[PDB]
């Protein structure tokens, strides 16, 4: 059974997401323009990422027990997870029809070529698109999606974590809420191994994140590309 606390945790995560994710994509008009030339999509996409980093921080602050962490633990959890949560939350704009992220217009519709135009290769792109397709095929409830994002953020094994025990107790409450949720609310046959599948996606994001870092370091090595990023991205991903 889903306790009152469990249901309250879920209600809070949904609202937090509803507050930090704008399915109209209206703000994208403020980004440097997309241009479709080496690295033509990088300014636009660097702005999209930096914007998304702010939304993810906003979401994280609303996670039950996250505010109980020290400032240091909050910073290290956000710094490692940011990219992963952005890949996760991006699933909402991803569409299987054209394997692309569709944000309401042709200008804000992003495909594999757009990503390559931001300085990425098939090495990262292929596993990213495969990740989006596998998540998409889970067809998660919105409740599940927002729980997965919270569980991704509050992982006790992220580098630089000091109070692993506290981070782990936070995550545990969220995992148990997810487990019970699937059991009580997710009907078969969709629920089959659903928890194990969602956890395997967290493993996939970690690999993707490891790969992303290598690419990010190669980009950080040419300061004329690094120049095109935002201050928040440099802070959060390093320089």
């Amino acid at each position: 059974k889903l306790s009152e606390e469990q249901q309250h945790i879920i209600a809070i995560l949904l609202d937090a997401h509803h507050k930090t994710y704008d399915p109209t994509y209206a703000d994208f008009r403020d980004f440097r323009p997309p241009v479709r030339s080496p690295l033509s999509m990088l300014p636009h996409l660097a702005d999209l990422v930096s914007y998304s980093i702010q939304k993810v921080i906003g979401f994280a602050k609303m996670i039950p027990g996250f505010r109980d962490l020290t400032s240091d633990d909050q910073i290290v959890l956000l710094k490692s997870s940011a990219i992963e949560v952005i890949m996760l939350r991006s699933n909402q704009s991803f569409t299987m029809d054209d394997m692309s992220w569709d944000c309401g217009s042709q200008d804000y519709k992003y495909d594999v070529t757009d990503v390559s135009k931001a300085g990425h290769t098939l090495e990262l792109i292929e596993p990213l698109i495969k990740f989006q397709v596998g998540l998409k095929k889970l067809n998660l409830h919105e409740e599940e999606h927002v729980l997965l994002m919270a569980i991704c953020i509050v992982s006790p094994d992220r580098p630089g974590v000091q109070d692993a025990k506290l981070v782990e107790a936070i995550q545990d409450r969220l995992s148990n809420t997810l487990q019970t949720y699937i059991r009580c609310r997710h009907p078969p046959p969709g629920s089959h191994q659903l928890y194990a599948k969602m956890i395997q996606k967290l493993a996939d994001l970690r690999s993707l994140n490891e790969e992303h870092s290598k690419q990010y370091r190669s980009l950080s090595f040419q300061p004329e590309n690094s120049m095109k990023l935002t201050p928040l991205v440099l802070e959060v991903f390093g320089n």
Binding site: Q54, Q74, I75
Partner: peptide
């Protein structure tokens, strides 16, 4: 500690 912008968005 080395992250003023992130720290300010956190508060």
């Amino acid at each position: 500690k080395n992250h003023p912008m992130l720290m300010n968005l956190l508060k």
